[PDB]
Every structure is written in structure tokens, then in C-alpha cells.
């Protein structure tokens, strides 16, 4: 049984920070679950151009609002709590957070990092 | 790209109900991600005794408080928002929600039919 908590994780090197986002890795490849599990913050007013060549991702919006754009079609979908999007086709997409957006993210294969 | 909505799903047959909990299936086996993805309410006052022989489950607590007990040792861990537990050893465990607890759950392999529903309380 593994038990961790966000507060403690954000005080370690399993919390990664970058330009436009921060991600707290609750689980990584080493934990052996066969997926990684992340709590990722997307910063208000960012333009996050994303594309996961090497993973499938699922994202559940926990807090905040914005939009995600599917570049295959240009369709824009609203993001609000309870919206779930899955990048099943290694989709190129663009997230524009209006407020900060808090997400729970699942990656397969696991981020191993 | 798949885009779903928790609030719409809660109104459908994909919101699975048992004594002690109501679990929304957001991602299904057939979505081909290699895991299933759920939002589950565990009801205040419950005692949920669970053990998955054939699935690894990770759980992030989104709202509410209670405890989880690891029955290998009897250790009791606090559940509150931000706590993540992973059942990496097919652990036998007991969740006791103080208030309603809301979770985001991941199963590997994906949940399908009825095996983890029955293994849950």
C-alpha cells in the first residue's frame, strides 16, 4: 500500500515546475501500477501547446475554467470541474486556462522520470 | 480525443451504485487507454471492505475525510483532500468515510463487467 499526499510531494523532486504549469507526481513508473498519476496545475493566462507522442493521457478537471482545442479539427471544448478529456490519438492540443486549472492526470505508459 | 462530463455521466447507467458508494465510469475499457478512470462517492458512515486480486487501484481523495486501514498490519491512514493511496500489493483494506469522501480512481487493467463492484463492500 502506498500512501502519499500532495503537500508533502510538492516539497520534493517529484514535483516538477515549468513555464505555464506545475505537476505533482503522485505515482511514477517505479511504483509499479502500470500508469503514472499526477496532479497538474495549469496557470491562468497560459497558452499550453501540448502533444504526447509517447503516452496516452486522461485528465479530469478538478478546479478552474478554460478551454482545450483539438488541432485535428480546431474544435474548442470548455474546461470546468467535472470535465474529463482523454488524449487517445496522441492528439495535438492547446489548453488555455482562464483561471488556474487543477487536474488529475493519468498516463499510460507511466511517466518514468 | 474523448471529452466527457461527470455531471452528465452521474445521470446514466455508467454511474454504478452499491451499498456505501456511487461510482461514475469516466473512462471505459473500450476507450483503449489500458486503464479505467472513475469518480466515486464513498458515503459517510460506511465500512467498505475491499480487496482486488486482479486489479491495481490508485485513488486520489478530492473531498471529505475518513480513514483507510491496511489489513496486513492494521495501520490506519488519514484520508483527507490530497491524499493518494495505491493498492500496489492487491492490499486487503477497509475505508471508513467520516463524511462523504469523493475520489478519483484508476484501475489497471480497466474495470469491465462486474469484478471490482462485487469486491467493494
Numbering used by the authors:
A (entry chain B): 1 to 113
B (entry chain A): 1 to 121
What text does the study give?
Each of these enzymes catalyzes as their main activity the cyclization of N-γ-acetyl-L-2,4-diaminobutyric acid (N-γ-ADABA), the reaction product of the 2,4-diaminobutyrate acetyltransferase (EctA), to ectoine with the concomitant release of a water molecule. We demonstrate here for the first time that the ectoine synthase is a metal-dependent enzyme, with iron as the most likely physiologically relevant co-factor. The EctC protein forms a dimer in solution and our structural analysis identifies it as a member of the cupin superfamily. The two crystal structures that we report here for the (Sa)EctC protein (with resolutions of 1.2 Å and 2.0 Å, respectively), and data derived from extensive site-directed mutagenesis experiments targeting evolutionarily highly conserved residues within the extended EctC protein family, provide a first view into the architecture of the catalytic core of the ectoine synthase.
The second crystal structure of the (Sa)EctC protein was solved at a resolution of 2.0 Å and contained four molecules of the protein in the asymmetric unit of which protomer A comprised amino acid Met-1 to Gly-121 and adopts a closed conformation. We therefore cannot exclude that this crystal structure does not represent the fully closed state of the ectoine synthase; consequently, we tentatively termed it the “semi-closed” (Sa)EctC structure. In the “semi-closed” structure, a longer carboxy-terminal tail is visible in the electron density, folding into a small helix (α-II) that closes the active site of the (Sa)EctC protein. The formation of this α-II helix induces a reorientation and shift of a long unstructured loop (as observed in the “open” structure) connecting β4 and β6, resulting in the formation of the stable β-strand β5 as observed in the “semi-closed”state of the (Sa)EctC protein. In the “semi-closed” crystal structure, (Sa)EctC has crystallized as a dimer of dimers within the asymmetric unit. This dimer is composed of two monomers arranged in a head-to-tail orientation and is stabilized via strong interactions mediated by two antiparallel β-strands, β-strand β1 (sequence 1MIVRN5) from monomer A and β-strand β8 from monomer B (sequence 82GVMYAL87). In the “semi-closed” structure of (Sa)EctC, each of the four monomers in the asymmetric unit contains a relative strong electron density positioned within the cupin barrel. Only the refinement of Fe2+ resulted in a visibly improved electron density, however with a low degree of occupancy. This possible iron molecule is bound via interactions with Glu-57, Tyr-85 and His-93. Since both the refinement and the distance did not clearly identify an iron molecule, we decided to conservatively place a water molecule at this position. However, in the “semi-closed” (Sa)EctC structure where the carboxy-terminal loop is largely resolved, a long stretched electron density feature was detected in the predicted active site of the enzyme; it remained visible after crystallographic refinement.
